Design an enzyme around this catalytic site. Structure first.
Site, PDB file in Angstrom:
ATOM      1  N   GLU A   1       5.230  -6.239  13.395  1.00 41.78           N
ATOM      2  CA  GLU A   1       5.821  -5.383  12.337  1.00 41.78           C
ATOM      3  C   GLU A   1       7.337  -5.603  12.315  1.00 41.78           C
ATOM      4  O   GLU A   1       7.856  -5.841  11.219  1.00 41.78           O
ATOM      5  CB  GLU A   1       5.464  -3.913  12.560  1.00 41.78           C
ATOM      6  CG  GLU A   1       4.142  -3.526  11.929  1.00 41.78           C
ATOM      7  CD  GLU A   1       4.039  -2.072  11.513  1.00 41.78           C
ATOM      8  OE1 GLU A   1       4.876  -1.262  11.957  1.00 41.78           O
ATOM      9  OE2 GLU A   1       3.129  -1.759  10.730  1.00 41.78           O
TER      10      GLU A   1
ATOM     11  N   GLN B   1       0.833  -1.196   0.000  1.00 37.16           N
ATOM     12  CA  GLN B   1       0.000   0.000   0.000  1.00 37.16           C
ATOM     13  C   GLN B   1       0.871   1.250   0.000  1.00 37.16           C
ATOM     14  O   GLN B   1       0.720   2.125  -0.861  1.00 37.16           O
ATOM     15  CB  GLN B   1      -0.938  -0.004   1.210  1.00 37.16           C
ATOM     16  CG  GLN B   1      -1.402   1.376   1.657  1.00 37.16           C
ATOM     17  CD  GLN B   1      -2.515   1.310   2.686  1.00 37.16           C
ATOM     18  OE1 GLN B   1      -2.345   1.733   3.829  1.00 37.16           O
ATOM     19  NE2 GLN B   1      -3.662   0.776   2.284  1.00 37.16           N
ATOM     20  N   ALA B   2       1.782   1.345   0.971  1.00 36.10           N
ATOM     21  CA  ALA B   2       2.699   2.477   1.011  1.00 36.10           C
ATOM     22  C   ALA B   2       3.520   2.559  -0.268  1.00 36.10           C
ATOM     23  O   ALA B   2       3.780   3.652  -0.784  1.00 36.10           O
ATOM     24  CB  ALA B   2       3.613   2.367   2.230  1.00 36.10           C
TER      25      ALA B   2
ATOM     26  N   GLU C   1      26.589   3.939 -10.408  1.00 35.23           N
ATOM     27  CA  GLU C   1      27.405   4.924  -9.709  1.00 35.23           C
ATOM     28  C   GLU C   1      26.963   5.125  -8.265  1.00 35.23           C
ATOM     29  O   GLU C   1      27.771   5.566  -7.439  1.00 35.23           O
ATOM     30  CB  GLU C   1      27.360   6.261 -10.451  1.00 35.23           C
ATOM     31  CG  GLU C   1      28.684   7.008 -10.467  1.00 35.23           C
ATOM     32  CD  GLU C   1      28.582   8.362 -11.140  1.00 35.23           C
ATOM     33  OE1 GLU C   1      27.972   8.443 -12.228  1.00 35.23           O
ATOM     34  OE2 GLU C   1      29.111   9.347 -10.584  1.00 35.23           O
TER      35      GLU C   1
ATOM     36  N   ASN D   1       9.499   6.820   9.938  1.00 32.41           N
ATOM     37  CA  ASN D   1       8.148   7.370   9.963  1.00 32.41           C
ATOM     38  C   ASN D   1       8.032   8.498  10.982  1.00 32.41           C
ATOM     39  O   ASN D   1       7.384   9.517  10.720  1.00 32.41           O
ATOM     40  CB  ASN D   1       7.139   6.264  10.272  1.00 32.41           C
ATOM     41  CG  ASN D   1       6.684   5.525   9.027  1.00 32.41           C
ATOM     42  OD1 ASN D   1       7.194   5.756   7.931  1.00 32.41           O
ATOM     43  ND2 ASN D   1       5.716   4.630   9.192  1.00 32.41           N
TER      44      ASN D   1
ATOM     45  N   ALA E   1      -1.597 -10.687   2.980  1.00 31.90           N
ATOM     46  CA  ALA E   1      -0.710 -11.405   3.887  1.00 31.90           C
ATOM     47  C   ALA E   1      -1.104 -11.232   5.349  1.00 31.90           C
ATOM     48  O   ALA E   1      -0.595 -11.962   6.206  1.00 31.90           O
ATOM     49  CB  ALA E   1       0.735 -10.948   3.682  1.00 31.90           C
TER      50      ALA E   1
ATOM     51  N   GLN F   1       1.346   3.880  -3.114  1.00 23.41           N
ATOM     52  CA  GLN F   1       1.058   5.287  -2.857  1.00 23.41           C
ATOM     53  C   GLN F   1       2.261   6.164  -3.189  1.00 23.41           C
ATOM     54  O   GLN F   1       2.119   7.207  -3.843  1.00 23.41           O
ATOM     55  CB  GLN F   1       0.640   5.480  -1.400  1.00 23.41           C
ATOM     56  CG  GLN F   1      -0.765   4.985  -1.091  1.00 23.41           C
ATOM     57  CD  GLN F   1      -1.188   5.277   0.336  1.00 23.41           C
ATOM     58  OE1 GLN F   1      -2.231   5.885   0.575  1.00 23.41           O
ATOM     59  NE2 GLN F   1      -0.377   4.843   1.295  1.00 23.41           N
TER      60      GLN F   1
HETATM   61  N1  GTP Z   1       5.373   6.405   4.749  1.00 24.42           N
HETATM   62  C1  GTP Z   1       4.344   5.565   4.619  1.00 24.42           C
HETATM   63  N2  GTP Z   1       4.265   4.465   5.363  1.00 24.42           N
HETATM   64  C2  GTP Z   1       3.155   3.742   5.082  1.00 24.42           C
HETATM   65  C3  GTP Z   1       2.173   4.025   4.171  1.00 24.42           C
HETATM   66  N3  GTP Z   1       1.202   3.038   4.177  1.00 24.42           N
HETATM   67  C4  GTP Z   1       1.601   2.194   5.084  1.00 24.42           C
HETATM   68  N4  GTP Z   1       2.773   2.563   5.676  1.00 24.42           N
HETATM   69  C5  GTP Z   1       3.495   1.833   6.705  1.00 24.42           C
HETATM   70  O1  GTP Z   1       3.762   0.540   6.217  1.00 24.42           O
HETATM   71  C6  GTP Z   1       3.490  -0.452   7.235  1.00 24.42           C
HETATM   72  C7  GTP Z   1       2.289  -1.260   6.810  1.00 24.42           C
HETATM   73  O2  GTP Z   1       2.592  -1.975   5.583  1.00 24.42           O
HETATM   74  P1  GTP Z   1       1.600  -1.971   4.326  1.00 24.42           P
HETATM   75  O3  GTP Z   1       2.322  -1.532   3.113  1.00 24.42           O
HETATM   76  O4  GTP Z   1       0.374  -1.215   4.668  1.00 24.42           O
HETATM   77  O5  GTP Z   1       1.187  -3.494   4.161  1.00 24.42           O
HETATM   78  P2  GTP Z   1       1.653  -4.457   2.999  1.00 24.42           P
HETATM   79  O6  GTP Z   1       3.124  -4.370   3.074  1.00 24.42           O
HETATM   80  O7  GTP Z   1       0.983  -4.115   1.747  1.00 24.42           O
HETATM   81  O8  GTP Z   1       1.204  -5.900   3.525  1.00 24.42           O
HETATM   82  P3  GTP Z   1      -0.069  -6.775   4.024  1.00 24.42           P
HETATM   83  O9  GTP Z   1      -0.815  -5.962   4.966  1.00 24.42           O
HETATM   84  O10 GTP Z   1       0.557  -7.934   4.688  1.00 24.42           O
HETATM   85  O11 GTP Z   1      -0.827  -7.140   2.827  1.00 24.42           O
HETATM   86  C8  GTP Z   1       3.346   0.369   8.519  1.00 24.42           C
HETATM   87  O12 GTP Z   1       4.617   0.621   9.101  1.00 24.42           O
HETATM   88  C9  GTP Z   1       2.704   1.649   7.988  1.00 24.42           C
HETATM   89  O13 GTP Z   1       2.848   2.757   8.845  1.00 24.42           O
HETATM   90  C10 GTP Z   1       2.282   5.189   3.386  1.00 24.42           C
HETATM   91  O14 GTP Z   1       1.525   5.603   2.515  1.00 24.42           O
HETATM   92  N5  GTP Z   1       3.416   5.917   3.695  1.00 24.42           N
HETATM   93 MG    MG Z   2      -1.806  -4.529   1.680  1.00 23.51          MG
END
Ligand code: GTP
Ligand code: MG
Ligand code: GTP
Ligand code: MG
EC number: 3.6.5.-
Lengths: 437, 341, 431
Positions: free
Chosen positions: A183, A11-12, A254, A206, A99, A15
């Site tokens: 986490e 997701q992150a 590089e 973060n 997951a 994004q």
């Molecule tokens: N900087 C930032 N951190 C994010 C964002 N979305 C989620 N996180 C962080 O990423 C972690 C959560 O992982 P996600 O990417 O949401 O989950 P995933 O890796 O897709 O995995 P599953 O939930 O197992 O499907 C936490 O530490 C969140 O705070 C974002 O848009 N920006």
């Molecule tokens: Mg996810």
């Protein structure tokens, strides 16, 4: 010429990729539909911005990216977003099950069904490119699809394309942004798995970005959009060297020679300046020596540490916009006569500086303001070891009880993985302590 | 533009500097110049800038020796593509009653902070840029006298900050602006805002197109400010962080929910998106907090026996709509203020 | 769209499942005809989790009835909501088991397991994304518990990547007069400790005491115990059936509430407690609801959470309240310097908020605790196992079918090890 491919998982990750592509299209002038009025060589050819956009018959500049996710919810927003006409439908890969913040699942159960499709899509996308440089993967460590699947894909890319770099842009989690207590468990696993399949890694604390948004940008409760915009700004400031034919860091190979003197040590420290709010558009002015002195501040770094104690192994400065070499020399002399700094005398790398004569850019209507000059410092330092001392510590807090560990063993992996991972962390800490002397 | 340090224990190798110095040596390819502390006292010979670099898009002649305003208009005239112009920290002497127009039509942004210009002077200075889209006049001690007539009708930015002589009577003069999409008012000393032209439940005719009102670090101590903000027609965004009413303490959220409850179309507050969950939480807190007073003011669930006073309506003009959105509070919801023995 | 296949074995399990289905049908807004007359958008926001999409917008449950005799299968088919269930979802035999685990687990159970797995697969194939399996049964009967354990083992062997939930019911002498109920209770516990992820312990002694004292009932029957069980079940799955800011995932919830793979037993509670017919009394505030839900009186198990240690706690509220109030209450409860400090709530509760209260009530709360006090229950039946196994009473009923005294000793050793681990972890430092 040579292009690059960016895989956005999680997701992150997706994004950050969307934010980066929006900023790139706004800078290059590419409209949402994919119409560049400044481009004249239609059909194809060779240009500075061609390293991240493929030209079609109708003049459409399709971003060279692959957005993969184990859930359809996140990709639905991109499919129904304003930039739906920019990305190609096939480039977006979705999954039916997530997951649930688990590394074993993303690395075995759910990963084994989507890894083949991801590899096929990457191969299909690379067939159009004549010469690929590496794979800029974007993930984090607080999820199961960002660590597990990322390591699973790195394991296959290290075999399919071994002569290509593999840069990363990880996101170091925080206890205030943490979404799960396992986490850390994911973080250690993916960290131990990508050590031999990654040249340079960029981590984003973060809490650091949260405090930056709260103070500089002046926000009461910074959301994920506020943090995704700053990461996009950072990624653009870093990739300007490849997107504008910059003299310094012309290619991906590089980055390993300038900021990675040691193979095992590949976690540089990236800082950027300035950070003005949208309200204070024309309140104060910062010189080339007032923004280069703001990148030697702990609170201005992306990771909370104390570089004043340790010593630096490398250093690369990148200015973007109106910057005269005389101003750069004056700022260097100021930084060399004011601040006290230590450096490794036996390191095969030193200080480097580069300039990009292009005006900055910010998302209209956002919280950031348009500045006249920007600076980005990438310096590897032993102080980053502190950032690990915390992570590993939490692991111990979860190792004496073995809580939530059976969930990871009852999905594919065994028990020796944890001992290997914490054994890899001990060796990394020992190497850091040795380099620090 | 046209024209070794040893840190730690390694040299400083510069790469690519020749490319930049050869790109900047081109005066016919200058897209932006920031002449700061360059000591610019005059424009020089006419025509020289119109043929050397007449394609400049941004100029920042801040902190220079510019004495008269004509010296700046001379440079702005030769530039037929001047999109941005910033001349702050310069003590310019503008005319007394002369308007210089036909010289800033391509000007989209104007900045004159710390210039010392008054209202009557800037009114005629901005005449040359009828299509101005942004204007910044902060840190000038400006005192508005009368409302503009045929000037500044395309301006969508009015930055009036660091001015301790900007009262509501002076804001009424700039509320007639037809395309004003933003109005900054930080560090101005304002303490209240009223709109007597409209009543309770109506929309004021002032500020027709205002969409962002910044009043951070101001004298906002009474809830009447947020209550009157409801009358604005298009107040989509609001900003207010350090006021006698707004605290950085952890117990400040209790006030935030009230702010969102005082405005109906406030989709963003303090640079943070608002969701239906946020709207519902804030609306349930406002009803839970002001239910007791609604009973004493003469309130009753009976649709024909509801007779409230005027003070309760003036203090809570957004409490009657909520009464219908989620019903009126019950008797068992207004008895949570006693301990046990 | 996460679909969960519901299952119910044994007479008690089938009755509890039917009661829970009938209770949630009135909350979701689906008339017993098989159509939706609800007037809330939030109702159909997650209806696919327990209902299928058929022609004409008719919602069909995802339940699978199973038995060894037909009496109870016939009573549910003719019940108030007996038409929504598919006719081919009813799997049954004729002779039953006879309050014998060996006869309901190895013979008739394994004989009808084929026909049961047939319908199980037919139902699982009609799902976009299967999340897990749920089963409702008892532990003091042969057919019920035997077939439950057998089906759980089969679903684990055929689907190791699926979660398992078992709302097992613990018998009690005050409700049944059968002598071989301890043996079946020990075997089912041994099987569940090996092939289960979640186990909601619902004691039949606490429910009887509640119906006798709290409800002030002269002669309570199964109708005063099944209603309470269905209410607690509806309060537990409030997030899985309606939206919510909190993560309403089953896998993540089980991972957070299963820090230990042998101590996965959860005590469920719910306030305010109501009877049948009379349910609209008053609307309790958030403090009163939190004080009543964490009280041993509103506990479905005979054990008191206070007599142990809190490992994991999950709270779910439903009615007309904001998350801010619940958060402030939960944060002030643990504040040792506040005027609302208690001594039976940990420093970390997974709170949830909902806007759809149950029928006949404006506000309700549910609690699920992984406390170690549940071990007491495991010691209540164990004692009985010593007053029978040593005398070899009724052992010819088990050994004559195929079971060995080696199976009984293994189950007893497993129960003893579980009790010892619980008592050992109960004395851990609260860091
Ligand atoms: N900087 C930032 N951190 C994010 C964002 N979305 C989620 N996180 C962080 O990423 C972690 C959560 O992982 P996600 O990417 O949401 O989950 P995933 O890796 O897709 O995995 P599953 O939930 O197992 O499907 C936490 O530490 C969140 O705070 C974002 O848009 N920006
Ligand atoms: Mg996810
Ligand atoms: N709370 C509750 N307990 C019940 C109910 N029906 C049966 N029990 C208990 O269930 C236990 C075993 O009976 P059942 O579950 O009906 O039997 P079965 O599981 O169908 O097994 P067989 O009789 O061998 O076919 C006894 O201890 C009963 O007290 C009920 O409706 N509610
Ligand atoms: Mg029976």
């Amino acid at each position: 010429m040579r292009e690059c491919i960016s895989i956005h998982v999680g997701q992150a990750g997706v994004q950050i990729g969307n934010a980066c592509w929006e900023l790139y299209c706004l800078e290059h002038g590419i409209q949402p539909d994919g119409q560049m009025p400044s481009d004249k060589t239609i059909g194809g050819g060779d240009d500075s911005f061609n390293t991240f956009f493929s030209e079609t018959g109708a003049g459409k500049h399709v971003p060279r990216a692959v957005f993969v996710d184990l859930e359809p919810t996140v990709i639905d927003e991109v499919r129904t977003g304003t930039y739906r006409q920019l990305f190609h439908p096939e480039q977006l890969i979705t999954g039916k099950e997530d997951a649930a913040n688990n590394y074993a699942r993303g690395h075995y159960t759910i990963g084994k069904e989507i890894i083949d499709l991801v590899l096929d899509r990457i191969r299909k996308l690379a067939d159009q490119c004549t010469g690929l440089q590496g794979f800029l993967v974007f993930h984090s460590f607080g999820g199961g699809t960002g660590s597990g699947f990322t390591s699973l894909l790195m394991e296959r890319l290290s075999v399919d394309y071994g002569k290509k770099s593999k840069l990363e842009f990880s996101i170091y989690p925080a206890p205030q942004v943490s979404t799960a207590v396992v986490e850390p468990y994911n973080s250690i696993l993916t960290t131990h798995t990508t050590l031999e399949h990654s040249d340079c890694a960029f981590m984003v604390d973060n809490e650091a970005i949260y405090d930056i948004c709260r103070r500089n940008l002046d926000i009461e409760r910074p959301t994920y959009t506020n943090l995704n915009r700053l990461i996009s700004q950072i990624v653009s400031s870093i990739t300007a060297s490849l997107r504008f034919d910059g003299a310094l860091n012309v290619d991906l190979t590089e980055f390993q020679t300038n900021l990675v003197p040691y193979p095992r040590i590949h976690f540089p420290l990236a800082t950027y300046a300035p950070v003005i709010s949208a309200e204070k558009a024309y309140h104060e002015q910062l010189s080339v020596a007032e923004i280069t002195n703001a990148c030697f501040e702990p609170a201005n770094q992306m990771v909370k540490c104390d570089p004043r104690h340790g010593k630096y192994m490398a250093c690369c400065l990148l200015y973007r916009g109106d910057v005269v070499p005389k101003d750069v020399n004056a700022a260097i002399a100021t930084i060399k006569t004011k601040r006290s700094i230590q450096f490794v005398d036996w390191c095969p790398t030193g200080f480097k500086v580069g300039i990009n004569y292009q005006p900055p850019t910010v998302v209209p209507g956002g919280d950031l303001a348009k500045v006249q000059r920007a600076v980005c410092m990438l310096s590897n330092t032993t102080a980053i070891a502190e950032a690990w001392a915390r992570l590993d510590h939490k692991f111990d807090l979860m190792y004496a009880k073995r809580a939530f560990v059976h969930w990871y063993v009852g999905e594919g992996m065994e028990e020796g993985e944890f001992s290997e991972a914490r054994e890899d962390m001990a060796a990394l800490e020992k190497d850091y302590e040795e380099v620090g002397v | 533009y046209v024209l070794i340090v040893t840190i730690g224990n390694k040299p400083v190798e510069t790469i690519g500097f020749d490319s930049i110095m050869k790109q900047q040596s081109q005066l016919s390819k200058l897209q932006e110049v920031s002449l700061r502390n360059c000591a610019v006292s005059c424009a020089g010979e006419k025509g020289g800038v119109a043929e050397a670099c007449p394609n400049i898009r941004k100029v920042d002649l801040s902190k220079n020796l510019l004495s008269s305003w004509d010296e700046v208009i001379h440079i702005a005239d030769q530039l037929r593509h001047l999109e941005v112009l910033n001349v702050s920290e310069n003590k310019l002497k503008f005319p007394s009653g002369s308007v210089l127009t036909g010289t800033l039509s391509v000007l989209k942004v104007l900045v004159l902070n710390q210039t010392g210009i008054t209202w009557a002077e800037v009114l005629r200075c901005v005449a040359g840029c009828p299509g101005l889209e942004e204007l910044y006049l902060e840190s000038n001690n400006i005192f508005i006298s009368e409302r503009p007539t045929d000037v500044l009708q395309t301006v969508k930015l009015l930055d009036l900050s660091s001015n301790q002589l900007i009262d509501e009577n002076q804001l009424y003069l700039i509320a007639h602006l037809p395309r004003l999409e933003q109005l900054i008012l930080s560090d101005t000393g304002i303490s209240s805002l009223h709109f007597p032209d409209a009543g309770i439940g109506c929309k004021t005719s002032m500020f027709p197109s205002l969409k962002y009102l910044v009043v951070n670090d101001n004298q906002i101590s009474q809830w009447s400010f947020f209550n009157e903000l409801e009358k604005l027609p298009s107040l989509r965004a609001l900003s207010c962080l350090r006021n006698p009413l707004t605290k950085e303490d952890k117990e400040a959220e209790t006030a935030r929910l009230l702010i969102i409850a005082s405005i109906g179309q406030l989709k963003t507050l303090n640079k943070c998106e608002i969701l239906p969950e946020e709207r519902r939480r804030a609306e349930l807190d406002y009803r839970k907090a002001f239910g007791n007073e609604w009973k004493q003011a003469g309130g009753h669930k009976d649709p024909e026996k509801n007779r409230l006073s005027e003070e309760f309506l003036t203090a809570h003009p957004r409490y009657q709509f909520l009464c219908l959105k989620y019903g009126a509070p019950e008797d068992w919801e207004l008895k949570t203020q006693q301990p046990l023995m | 769209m996460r679909e969960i296949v519901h299952i119910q074995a044994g007479q008690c399990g089938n009755q509890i499942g039917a009661k829970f289905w009938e209770v949630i049908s009135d909350e979701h807004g689906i008339d017993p005809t098989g159509t939706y007359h609800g007037d809330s958008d939030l109702q159909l926001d997650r209806i696919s989790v327990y209902y299928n999409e058929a022609t004409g917008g008719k919602y069909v449950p995802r339940a699978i009835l199973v038995d060894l005799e037909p009496g109870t299968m016939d009573s549910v088919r003719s019940g108030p909501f007996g038409q929504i269930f598919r006719p081919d979802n009813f799997v049954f035999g004729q002779s039953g088991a006879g309050n014998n685990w060996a006869k309901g687990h190895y013979t008739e159970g394994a004989e009808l397991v084929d026909s049961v797995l047939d319908v199980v697969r037919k139902e699982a194939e009609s799902c976009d994304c299967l999340q897990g399996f749920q089963l409702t049964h008892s532990l003091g009967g042969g057919t019920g518990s035997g077939m439950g354990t057998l089906l759980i083992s089969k679903i684990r062997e055929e689907y190791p990547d699926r979660i398992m939930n078992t709302f097992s019911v613990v018998p009690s002498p005050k409700v049944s007069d059968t002598v071989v109920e301890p043996y079946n209770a020990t075997l089912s516990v041994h099987q569940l400790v090996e092939n289960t992820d979640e186990t909601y312990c619902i004691d039949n002694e606490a429910l009887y005491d509640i119906c006798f004292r709290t409800l002030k009932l002269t002669t309570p029957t199964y109708g005063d115990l099944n209603h309470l069980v269905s209410a607690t079940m509806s309060g537990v799955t409030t997030c899985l059936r309606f939206p919510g800011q909190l993560n309403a995932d089953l896998r993540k919830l089980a991972v957070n509430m299963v820090p230990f793979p042998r101590l996965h037993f959860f005590m469920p509670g719910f306030a305010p407690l109501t009877s049948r017919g009379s349910q609209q009394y008053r609307a309790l505030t958030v403090p009163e609801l939190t004080q009543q839900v964490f009280d041993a009186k509103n506990m479905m198990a005979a054990c008191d959470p206070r007599h142990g240690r809190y490992l994991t706690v999950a709270a779910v509220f439903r009615g007309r309240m904001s998350m801010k109030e619940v958060d402030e209450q939960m944060l002030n409860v643990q504040n040792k310097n506040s005027s609302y400090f208690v001594e039976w709530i940990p420093n970390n509760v997974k709170t949830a908020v909902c806007d759809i209260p149950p029928r006949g009530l404006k506000m309700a709360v549910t609690f699920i605790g992984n406390s170690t006090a549940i071990q007491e229950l495991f010691k209540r039946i164990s004692e009985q196992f010593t007053a029978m196994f040593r005398r070899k009473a009724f052992l010819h009923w088990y050994t004559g079918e195929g079971m060995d005294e080696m199976e009984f000793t293994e189950a007893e050793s497993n129960m003893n090890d579980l009790v010892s681990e619980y008592q050992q972890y109960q004395d851990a430092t609260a860091e």
